[PDB]
Write a protein that holds these residues in place. Sequence first.
Motif, PDB file in Angstrom:
ATOM      1  N   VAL A  39       0.809  -1.206   0.000  1.00  0.00           N
ATOM      2  CA  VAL A  39       0.000   0.000   0.000  1.00  0.00           C
ATOM      3  C   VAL A  39       0.848   1.265   0.000  1.00  0.00           C
TER       4      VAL A  39
ATOM      5  N   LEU B 228       4.258  -5.089 -10.625  1.00  0.00           N
ATOM      6  CA  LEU B 228       3.645  -3.794 -10.408  1.00  0.00           C
ATOM      7  C   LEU B 228       4.237  -2.859 -11.438  1.00  0.00           C
TER       8      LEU B 228
ATOM      9  N   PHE C  62      -1.414 -10.194  -6.574  1.00  0.00           N
ATOM     10  CA  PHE C  62      -2.767  -9.781  -6.215  1.00  0.00           C
ATOM     11  C   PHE C  62      -3.788 -10.758  -6.769  1.00  0.00           C
TER      12      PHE C  62
ATOM     13  N   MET D  78       2.802   1.531  -3.605  1.00  0.00           N
ATOM     14  CA  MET D  78       1.906   1.952  -4.685  1.00  0.00           C
ATOM     15  C   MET D  78       1.503   3.407  -4.482  1.00  0.00           C
ATOM     16  N   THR D  79       1.180   3.747  -3.236  1.00  0.00           N
ATOM     17  CA  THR D  79       0.776   5.104  -2.880  1.00  0.00           C
ATOM     18  C   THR D  79       1.877   6.096  -3.190  1.00  0.00           C
TER      19      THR D  79
ATOM     20  N   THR E 162      -5.831  -2.088  -7.833  1.00  0.00           N
ATOM     21  CA  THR E 162      -5.352  -2.989  -6.797  1.00  0.00           C
ATOM     22  C   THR E 162      -5.754  -4.432  -7.044  1.00  0.00           C
TER      23      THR E 162
ATOM     24  N   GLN F 259      -6.817   1.106   1.534  1.00  0.00           N
ATOM     25  CA  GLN F 259      -6.027   1.881   0.583  1.00  0.00           C
ATOM     26  C   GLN F 259      -6.816   3.091   0.081  1.00  0.00           C
TER      27      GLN F 259
ATOM     28  N   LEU G 110      -4.992   4.231  -9.567  1.00  0.00           N
ATOM     29  CA  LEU G 110      -4.487   3.116  -8.787  1.00  0.00           C
ATOM     30  C   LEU G 110      -5.375   1.884  -8.966  1.00  0.00           C
TER      31      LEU G 110
ATOM     32  N   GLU H 237      -9.471   4.954  -8.090  1.00  0.00           N
ATOM     33  CA  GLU H 237      -9.008   3.689  -7.519  1.00  0.00           C
ATOM     34  C   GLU H 237      -9.872   2.541  -8.027  1.00  0.00           C
TER      35      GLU H 237
END
Length: 186
Positions: free
Chosen positions: A42, A157, A177, A45-46, A126, A67, A124, A59
């Motif tokens: 988290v 990623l 994921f 990626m953030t 996820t 997240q 984003l 998102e």
Amino acid sequence: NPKADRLIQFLTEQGITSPQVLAAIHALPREFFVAPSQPYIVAKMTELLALTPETKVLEIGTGSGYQTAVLAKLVNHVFTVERIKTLQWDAKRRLKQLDIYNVSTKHGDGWQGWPARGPFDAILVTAAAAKVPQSLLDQLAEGGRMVIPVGEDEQYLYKIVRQGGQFISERVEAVRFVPLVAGDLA
Ligand SMILES: Nc1ncnc2c1ncn2[C@@H]1O[C@H](CSCC[C@H](N)C(=O)O)[C@@H](O)[C@H]1O
Ligand SMILES: [Ca+2]
């Protein structure tokens, strides 16, 4: 308090020291987002989205809303999409309980993004996709950043930017994921 501090301490050891991201994270009772894994993922990626208070975020995969909450502390407004109905309900409920009101949730299919709401500065995602949903690319504002898990068995990623009209891809690091599922809703 120990747990907040322990976690932030952990992240810094992993190489995550963006004061912005660490504070956003520290402010959120992680254990609360299990109402009805790696907080490092988290944070990373953030951090990659390079958020600013003027950033408009999309998102994909609201989930627990953890997240989501991280994002909301960092930008003026978040638009988030979850395909599982009950998950959307919960997360929505959690965000109000934490007085986080700059978030628009939607029960729908992230493969399609959220066109209505204008181009986005940060995207984003996820959930893993074997290939970048082209719809997302199409919804990426100029100078925007996208972060997404790409692949099947193997997953990486990716950070993609739109600059000078050109899309540029950076492979970041291996992840795992659950799949971004296309089609109908649940
Ligand atoms: N096509 C799709 N569109 C939107 N969400 C999807 C999707 N396919 C799977 N998802 C959702 O993406 C989520 C991945 S778990 C995502 C973690 C979440 N950010 C959190 O903090 O908890 C799951 O909730 C899954 O239901
Ligand atoms: Ca770092």
